[PDB]
């Protein structure tokens, strides 16, 4: 009975969530890229975030995560977009700054050392 | 799991403008007044005072609409519904 | 669960973290160890060694003999190691290009030195106060041959403002702003005095062992009697006095409460930094501190308020998901997410921070559409990065200490020790440009003032090729570089720059 009630509640919530977005754009807006939101596209997330559909795809390519990085590499962003639904689903999954992309970067194993210390040091 | 995965994803806009006043909000060709208005803010914060006080409204239909434009149709700002 | 380490005095807990393991074979600690801010200075027979908290060597000084047999060496607020001699005071600026400077007395005829603490001196006889200026002394209240009958140095301690000097009959405070004497007590026999940064006082008696912490005269905040004799009475930083007994620390509190902090090896010299009680052992380093209320309920065994159950929701997630979803209907999702965000800010291990951050992230989707600002989460996630990067080169610091001194204070401490590549990498990750050229100008000055047997063309080529990387215009003045080049034989290079 509890499982049936939970399933009914989940279905009702999912049905209500459809076509009820009602998200709003502020007088003038921008983020991540910095330049201007209204110049390329309107990839918008909740909790007030804005992206250009290009800065976000640049972030995932530069992100330290491996499986997601190679998963997008099948299309190479140039091979074939097909119906673009696959790219739309892949790109729009995280907030960009409030998600695991930046949380998993608080240790910074990267330390660029290429014997260049002999030049710009000592 | 399906319900949890459907509460953080965002949405884009595929259309180029609304369907009640034409114009354009996404593609190249914006009115220079909007570009000047953006320059007024985030540069010196001198004074943002202009008739351009219409915040765009994004929907699941991705069509997109203004607020004053929808207000012209005697629509209360609590039951915004796309015209499909 | 981290609750094992925590003990409990009245109404609060005290943490005991562990960071830094410095190795010395048998007794290389010996004696006469100086310690301020993770720059430990230790001698053995004829050498002075300076180390970090990670055991790496940093420099070497006291080679050859400078005469004027040394009595003490102390650090200061700018890590410029001061050395006190019999007839003058020495200050060291450059380690490899040695630049020892000396300041003598204004009249080395009668009496030279008794002792010297932070910004304050004391001569042998006719006890008088001299304030330490830039490179000279400033006179203060003059003794009328009726001040003190003190017997040893343990009868006075300096501070930022007050210069309270203990006596055997009457404690006599002196205001350093005007150098004005003022009696404080009428009947006492204290033998040891300690003072806090905020102005708190602590007075020992070494007979009927007891303590008397002071904020103002005639008011007693505590009369905690003590047993046996302490060794290194110290402070935790405007919080509570601390005492130790060889291989033990006995933290105290109101109504005579006790806290035990047993450690394996021993307790060597101890410091009393701000909100810290940095303990140096013979093999490792500890950071005894105190819990804070915002993080005192998430990890506390048994909790009901928001927090410590959002973490429970996240831990329960991935199994029995309906239960985890149903949990988020009893506690308001405002205090819990705030505490979760401002809970990983002051963590040490890079594993609890990840869990706290992802738990806090799973605290915003269920919240209202536009009711909570998202800037706090980004600010916390960005401020974790700087501390994590800092705890890689050797320097260790907390969030509160990082507030006391600006980023320039951190950059100077590492520019001092001839590490010109590390610094330039903090500025990139910290996303700053104002303090960029300040590293380059120092590096250029040191390079010009370094190797004298160079050639003008190649030196200019290097000094201008290294400028290509930097693309920023602030504090990049090279007029000083040209002047210091002109200050010595190189004139053509100075003109060409």
Numbering used by the authors:
A (entry chain C): 797 to 918
B (entry chain F): 1181 to 1264
C (entry chain B): 3 to 499
Text taken from the publication that reported this structure:
The hexameric HOPS and CORVET are evolutionarily conserved tethering complexes within the endolysosomal system of eukaryotic cells. Early endosome fusion is promoted by the Rab5 GTPase and its effector, the hexameric CORVET tethering complex, which is homologous to the lysosomal HOPS. Vps11 and Vps18 form the central core to which Vps33 and Vps16 are attached as an SM module to promote SNARE assembly. The two unique subunits determine the respective Rab specificity of the tethering complexes.
CORVET was produced in yeast cells and isolated via a FLAG tag on Vps8 using affinity chromatography followed by size exclusion chromatography (SEC) with high purity. From 33882 micrographs, 219391 selected particles provided a consensus map with 4.6 Å resolution. Local refinements further improved the resolution to 3.8 Å (SNARE-binding module). CORVET and HOPS share strong structural homology. Their respective cores, consisting of identical subunits (Vps11 and Vps18), are virtually indistinguishable from each other. Vps3 and Vps8 are specific to CORVET and located at the distal ends of the complex. Similarly, to the analogous subunit Vps39 in HOPS, the C-terminal α-helix of Vps3 is anchored to CORVET’s core through an interaction with the RING finger domain and the long α-helix located at the C-terminus of Vps11. In contrast, the CORVET subunit Vps3 lacks any further C-terminal extensions after the long α-helix, thus significantly reducing the contact area in the Vps3-Vps11 interface. Vps8 exhibits a characteristic elbow configuration, which turns its N-terminal half towards the β-propeller of Vps11. Moreover, a hairpin protruding from the Vps8 RING finger domain is sandwiched in a hydrophobic groove between Vps33 and Vps18, clamping the SNARE-binding unit from both sides together with the C-terminus of Vps18. In addition to the C-terminal interaction with Vps18, and distinctive from HOPS, the α-solenoid of Vps8 has two additional interfaces with Vps11.
